[PDB]
């Protein structure tokens, strides 16, 4: 028997919505260690001989995400269900519901790791966005709130 | 003793160390003016009174300026980077001395520093240059 | 104690958030039912036996009163 705050997970986001979430999220990769290093050597070769705006990426640290929700800066928050200590993330759907930040439980922790240059991530969030994907993001917010939140209003109940 | 009996018996020898004279006559090491003016025949406290300098700052338990002037003798006797200087050249030639315009500027003053920061660095720039 | 331990809006938020998300412990699950049936008198008796001192049991039963009243109404 599962106490309602556990198994608020497993009632995860479905097939098509999850695919569309990654269609958005895979656009916003953090610049990998190799890519970042080569860019700075390009900067070294250029600026030593002879401007840029703030670049948007996903935010992916548990401490960073728990900061961003309640900041409030997070817009979408993805949460993996499979976590070795489950108690690490059990409060997080409740925190998002309380602060009114739209969240989604995604399926697979390594699935979050792929979009983020890590092995696993447990939580991923998209704070800010480029102007072109703004309408698409807000549409996905409504899509997730209709599919995830409104269908499973009774997820806080039932063992 | 068991082990000591062998060491006296063996043809290996003992690691003979004569280091009892050095435990008393310690050379001063940390000041050259003192290194010249320090009578080793005298003690620690007697050497301090001979110099002038205090050996103890508290009221001591029990009972009891040629050099100090030379210490007062030795008591009698930072730029900006290339990018920083060249960046300040860009600001000065653009605005002049309008620090309000200079910090509300976006293209040249990228890191949004205050009026006080920019003007201080310009004062240092105006010393090395015009 | 100049730095005694001021309210701190964040800490109050976290404590009350965890207070509901965790649920209720078995003695507290018994205790809240014991308030509604046997009154606040017998509730303080069981809480004093369960915990160490009575000074703990006062603030504990008082916390249960706040939880019950805020749940049913609002």
């Amino acid at each position: 028997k599962v106490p309602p705050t556990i198994a608020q997970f497993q009632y995860t986001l479905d097939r098509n919505t999850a695919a569309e979430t990654f269609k958005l999220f895979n656009k916003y990769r953090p610049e990998t260690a190799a890519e970042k290093k080569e860019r700075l050597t390009k900067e070294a070769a250029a600026v030593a001989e002879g401007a840029s705006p703030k670049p948007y990426a996903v935010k992916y640290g548990l401490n960073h995400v728990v900061a961003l929700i309640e900041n409030k800066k997070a817009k979408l928050v993805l949460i993996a269900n499979d976590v070795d200590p489950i108690e690490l993330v059990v409060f997080l759907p409740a925190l998002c519901k309380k602060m009114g930040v739209p969240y989604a439980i995604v399926k697979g922790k390594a699935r979050l790791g792929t979009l983020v240059n890590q092995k696993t991530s447990a939580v991923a969030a998209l704070t800010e966005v480029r102007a072109e994907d703004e309408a698409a993001l807000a549409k996905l917010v409504s899509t997730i709130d209709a599919n995830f939140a409104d269908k499973y209003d009774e997820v806080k109940k039932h063992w | 003793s068991v082990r000591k009996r062998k060491m006296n018996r063996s043809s290996v020898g003992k690691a003979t160390r004569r280091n009892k004279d050095k435990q008393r006559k310690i050379n001063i090491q940390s000041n050259p003016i003192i290194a010249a003016n320090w009578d080793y025949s005298l003690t620690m406290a007697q050497n301090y009174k001979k110099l002038g300098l205090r050996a103890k700052l508290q009221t001591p338990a029990g009972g009891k300026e040629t050099e100090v002037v030379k210490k007062l003798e030795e008591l009698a006797s930072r730029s900006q980077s290339e990018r920083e200087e060249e960046w300040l050249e860009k600001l000065y030639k653009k605005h002049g001395d309008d620090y309000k315009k200079m910090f509300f500027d976006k293209k040249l003053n990228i890191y949004q520093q205050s009026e006080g920061d920019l003007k201080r660095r310009l004062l240092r720039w105006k010393k090395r240059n015009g | 104690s100049y730095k005694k331990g001021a309210a701190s809006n964040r800490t109050k938020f976290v404590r009350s958030l965890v207070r509901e998300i965790a649920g209720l412990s078995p003695y507290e699950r018994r205790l809240i039912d014991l308030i509604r049936n046997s009154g606040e008198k017998r509730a303080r008796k069981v809480a004093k036996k369960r915990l160490g001192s009575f000074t703990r049991a006062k603030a504990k039963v008082e916390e249960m009163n706040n939880i019950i009243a805020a749940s049913r109404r609002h």
Binding site: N71, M99 | - | L17
Partner: peptide
């Protein structure tokens, strides 16, 4: 029963100023 979270939050839980490091390029 999702009791406390039904009353949805308004100001963030802190009041910390956000530093100049989160504006001018890093």
């Amino acid at each position: 029963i999702d009791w406390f979270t039904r009353h949805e939050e308004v100001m963030p839980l802190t009041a910390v100023p956000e530093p100049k490091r989160r504006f001018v390029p890093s």
